[PDB]
């Protein structure tokens, strides 16, 4: 579907997302320990059955029946992780997460509150401003002509120099800011 | 112990002008108020009565607060 | 991490369970009658609620 | 930005059917536009028609809550199918079969209410009597009239 | 609410209407008969500002109740005679009410009985 | 800071349902692997919970004895 | 509310909940073993195991993250990482 | 009379007061929910007074 | 000192919280056998209600014609 | 202090407190607590701002009107005659609106104060405000945002003819 | 009213004296003084008006625009300083000069006994406001919004000139006190109706109504933000006042003429509301939302009721603050992140907190809070066409719920949620913007105390 | 066997329903690499331009403006008066108006007519 590095979904890996989806939602109808342990059990046995199969076209007709039983069969609202997609406390926190740019413009008066984490700061962006034009440079060199096939970056080939396009991924805000 | 930094965005400016607002609006604020309380303290208002035979009151004559009537 | 050891909450529910047991009680004792209580029917009409209830 | 960039009118040969595919930034063999009914629309593509609530929750947007990316082709009605607006998500129930229970139940609450109040229930007592006229001067009737008097007797 | 079966699912005839009630003369069948007393005066009822739909017949007991009261203040439950008086004698003019209502519904089966005789001769 | 886990030797499935649900796989010719995983919950201060009825009458034997202790005191303070 | 976590606490439970499980030899296993080569498990097993891992920490790992968390030492950096610890 | 009609206006006053209080704050208010919630217990006795007037 | 979390296990408890807990149900239990001892008549029933088809027709004014 | 004639209100009759219960009531208590803590300080200021507003008196009078002709003895077109006469109209359109506003708080007034007798014991101030505003109804209803005595005029021509026909009829 | 008209023609001097460095804070401040001045024309009767001279008139409907007026100049002196930044010196002295011009044009406008005069004035503030908007503006299609805005009104305007100088030859004269008393009724027939058509269409088209509005999402746009202020907090008000002034001539042909524009006002709130509902464009957004107030005010000019016109004056004053508020907040954005697009910077308030508190409390007055004088308005409008007919409480509520929709759909969009990643030149709010914001809010919050000097002359 | 999933235009088919997504031709795999191609290298372009330590400003995005442009100042550019386009704007412009004048009308007339025979009950209305 829309993965980053694969064009596609491989038929392992739909089975793979098939049977956890399975195993949530029948977790969902079967909301005790022992009781979801045993159909778990046998849910596996289930997929366990037809492991072995070579045919290529009966494996894909295997998948789009399993596929067909499991939307007849799926709880109307299923256990979603709170700080799952859809859950309820999911981007909660997105109104506290101040981006870090924010604070070059502070006053100096606030600023001398915290004279060491400042410091700090100056040396991590000098830096970052001294290794990005090597890190464009690395990126240049690699990518292959007629533009990047995935969205998958290089690390950093030498010693000294840092992976290419890290800033803002490393100075990310935390999850509880 | 494990104190981390909180990122915020700049407070300084807005509080700035909060004081800066309440300061100006204080300077004539305060002494307005103290003025009509000390009006209405000693000077005080004026008092309902019928005409005088034969005077013509002025036009600033039919009204009660002493600030309405200057 | 299971906890519950916070003054504010403990007193907090016990000021509302407190209301709970004992507030309807007191409320229905002192308003004033504003209309005429039915207080005559058979015993299942009497009954209909606890029973409902119960089922 | 320039004139080249922005978008035109409706492409009839192939050859500005492919400029305008790579300009939107996408492939010749996806890139629809809009028929040409005088509507309006130019060579806008026609993107399926999807809300933002069922793209990849997971996957790394550029921008994450509108779960769009920079330089993809946005949806002609982009800011009706965003998070806070419409959803297009598959429902576990087919729509015409909750369209039918909800309208079905619906018809008979209130038909059941219609028969209810043509047959309502009540109690084996007589009507409430009331002293002193069925209290005409408390009810408003002016005093220097005379009412019909109603007279309650004991049973 | 077996009178709610007799009436919907069985015949209207028998069984009376409860919006048009009493259909019979009050001396029908009874001999000299009496009115209800009222104990509490029109001026009482005024004063004591009783709402209109409970200036009923027994009136007298809930000014008593609704003094005792006012006067009992704090102990809210100082009095529950006066309440308890009142409440029997509003169960006491339910149950008139009551025995107004099975009269109307003999009334109406006896002369039921009267016109089916009436067309058994003629 | 740093928290002792305790030992996972003491985790057996023995005198729980997750026994009985082993005992009916193993007649059908299954078996769970996470079953002494789950084990936690059915031992130790979890055991044993009580009903719903039990649930509703908590403290009524207290409460009880208060009330009768109330009605004899009443009884005699009428005299 | 909410404790911290450390890499050690994670290790010691990431290492707690693959212990408890019946098909790894708990004498055998370590914070690199592989899950197909050095312990021979399909991939459903691994399905399993990171249902398990999400059971216990609490959190969701999505699919496509999933599919390459092979051995126990991968789970703690990316549970570190997911959690921002040693901070 | 004088003193129904002053307990229930000085009742919603003292409600309102704690908006202006954080208002025209200046420094940060040493532990602002406490001050809430004492005004409404003192505004809950204040209003509970002129019901027992009703009641009686 | 606070409560220190425990790892699957039964989580520690306060003796005050237990005894807060069970006082409180003892009192709603209390109350509940108390109001019912006293009253009994909200919930049971104040007054008899009497079956109309027992009256006879002499008091109602019945003619017998 | 105001007028007790334009805004009538009947006698108090308050009973007389009758303890049957030996618990004392705290509103009496609240009461004493009231009068030596709340009612003795402000009466003492207000003495002192009255000490202090005695100091000093002066007056502000009620202004007078006198009469000029009315729109119905003014040449038309003469906008001198005209217009004292709308400007008398317009005046005494602001006091009639007050006079109705009067009646109806002496209405909202014993609506208040009768309790629940109320639609026995204020049947004569529920008269007084039909007829008054049947008479503002007949008077300046209708008229529009540009009313003018113009306007006033030719309706009560109007009215008068339909209740000239009227009587004609009837005859 | 001479008292001030000079001072405003003596601010031209002062700013073409004035240094290099010290035009805005001279001008700023004798402006600011002017405004203090203009409360002495609160002395009004409550029967006859305050009559200057044979020229010069101002009742209780004119005086609230003209202190709107006096007031709304120092703001638009306030915040149009900083994009006129690098702009050469006689370029901005210019600018102050079409400002100062367009105040005294306004301030001789609603004062005007004479309707001729009233008309010339009326005609003479469209070009400081052309000028403005096609040399200042920052698009392309300026040069076209200030095409069809002058088109428009002068196609508008043309019969009315026809018109007035027929009632001035007809009547005898056009001095608005003489004909309060002189007025004839006007009978049915085709020639008064193309008399009400021609007096009457100027002010709908300077309004708007709907099918005339199509200029106001142009001019309102390639403005700048002093022109924008100024188009949307008097400019349409001059069709407001002239018809105020103009239906007194235009009876008892009113009752009927009226029908076809107030289902086009009726049904166009609706119309614009939703319009509202999908716009890409924060400026287009406040453009329409001044439509579907004005259309509201139109109504209940129409409809000629004694509620009417209060809720009418009363919605015109709190509308012109609002919008101002709005279309300063808009601006302040526009500086901040270069584009006009709503969907580009989200998320503000975690960047921008007082700033976010007035977009919330501007929103707040935009869909009628009370006890706000815009639901004042809004509410006494809704009677008084409740009174008229009963389907439009159907039609008002409709309108009512749209209405807040499209505000916090404005307020949502561009506060709340995830904030823009690459947009990092998000500066702290400065004083003047802030300044410039509470200068719009307080006098709005302080009219709900005393709303009485804003309920027109029928108070 | 199971109900069909029917899709509507506010419910759409799930992906794991569609029949076109387990397909494994190389037209379709040609087609998928195509658009990952595609979406990465746009995605290059944008952390470029987001990645710079010397860049404070907006990374303008073509898509919006062409997005914004489109939805504004296109529409008369590409709109041709026929049977549709004309259809329609009688319909939605002349339709409600004419409707709601002949309703309020109506309501207005009957209104009219019934106080001018002292019919309707005006009693204490004298605000208007
Ligand atoms: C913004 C776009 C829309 C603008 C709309 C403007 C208004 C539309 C109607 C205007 C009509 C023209 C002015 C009429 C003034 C009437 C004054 C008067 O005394 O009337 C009574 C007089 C009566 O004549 P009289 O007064 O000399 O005679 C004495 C009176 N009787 C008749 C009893 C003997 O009316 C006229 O003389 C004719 C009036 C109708 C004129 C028709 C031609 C114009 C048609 C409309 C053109 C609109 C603009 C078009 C262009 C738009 C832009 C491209
Ligand atoms: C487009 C943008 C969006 C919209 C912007 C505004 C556009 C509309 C503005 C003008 C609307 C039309 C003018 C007002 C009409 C009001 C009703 C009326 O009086 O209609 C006239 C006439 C009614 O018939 P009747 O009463 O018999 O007329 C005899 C009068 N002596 O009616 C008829 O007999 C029917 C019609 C006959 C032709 C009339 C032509 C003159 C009027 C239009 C110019
Ligand atoms: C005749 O039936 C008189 C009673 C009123 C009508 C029927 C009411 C039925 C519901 C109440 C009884 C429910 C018993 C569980």
Redesign the pocket.
Known sequence: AFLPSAAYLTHQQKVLQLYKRALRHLESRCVHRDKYRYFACLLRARFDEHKNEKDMVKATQLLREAEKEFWHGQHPQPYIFPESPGGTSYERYECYKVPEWCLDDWHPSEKAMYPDYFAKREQWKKLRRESWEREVKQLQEETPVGGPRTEALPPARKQGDLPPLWWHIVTRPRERP | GKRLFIIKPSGFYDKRFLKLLRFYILLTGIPVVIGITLINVFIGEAELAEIPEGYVPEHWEYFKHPISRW | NINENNPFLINSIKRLLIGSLFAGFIISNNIPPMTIPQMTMPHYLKMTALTVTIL | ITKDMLPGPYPKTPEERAAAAKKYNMRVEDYEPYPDDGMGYGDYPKLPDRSQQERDPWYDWDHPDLRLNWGEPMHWDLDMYIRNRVDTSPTPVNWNLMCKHLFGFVAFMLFMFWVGETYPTYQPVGPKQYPYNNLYLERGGDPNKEPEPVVHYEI | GAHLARRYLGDASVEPEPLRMPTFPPDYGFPERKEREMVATQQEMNDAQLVLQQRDYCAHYLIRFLKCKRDSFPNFLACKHEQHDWDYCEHLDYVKRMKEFERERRLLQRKKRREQREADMA | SKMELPDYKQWKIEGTPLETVQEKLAARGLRDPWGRNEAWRYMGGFANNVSFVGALLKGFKWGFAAFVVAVGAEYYLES | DAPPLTLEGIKDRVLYVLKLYDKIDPEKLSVNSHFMKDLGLDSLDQVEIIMAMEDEFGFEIPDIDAEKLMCPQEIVDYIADKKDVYE | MNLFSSLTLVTLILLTMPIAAINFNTHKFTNYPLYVKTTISCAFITSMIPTMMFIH | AHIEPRYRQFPQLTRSQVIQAEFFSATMWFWILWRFWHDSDAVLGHFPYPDPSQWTDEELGIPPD | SWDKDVYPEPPRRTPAPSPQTSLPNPITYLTKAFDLLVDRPVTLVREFIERQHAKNKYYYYHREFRRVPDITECHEKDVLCMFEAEMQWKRDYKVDQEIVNIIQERLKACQQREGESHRQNCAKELQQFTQVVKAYQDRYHDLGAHYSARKCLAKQKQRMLAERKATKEAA | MLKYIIPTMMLMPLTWLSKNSMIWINTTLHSLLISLTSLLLLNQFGDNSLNFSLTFFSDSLSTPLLILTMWLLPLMLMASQHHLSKENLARKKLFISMLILLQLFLIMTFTATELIFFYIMFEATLVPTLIIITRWGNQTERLNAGLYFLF?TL??SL?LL??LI?IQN?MGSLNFLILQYWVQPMPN????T??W??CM??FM?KMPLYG?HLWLPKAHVEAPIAGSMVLAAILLKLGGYGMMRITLLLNPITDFMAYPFIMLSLWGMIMTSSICLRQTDLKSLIAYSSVSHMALVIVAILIQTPWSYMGATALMIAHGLTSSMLFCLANSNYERVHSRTMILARGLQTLLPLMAAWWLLASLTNLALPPSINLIGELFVVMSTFSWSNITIILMGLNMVITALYSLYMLITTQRGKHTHHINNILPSFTRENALMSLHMLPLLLLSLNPKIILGPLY | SFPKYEPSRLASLPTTLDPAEYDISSETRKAQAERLAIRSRLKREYQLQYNDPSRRGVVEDPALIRWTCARSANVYPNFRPNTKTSLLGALFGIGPLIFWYYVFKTDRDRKEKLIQEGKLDRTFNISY
């Open positions: 428009y196609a508008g019969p026809v018109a027929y007809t027939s085709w020639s008064n193309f008399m058509l021609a269409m100027a088209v005339l």
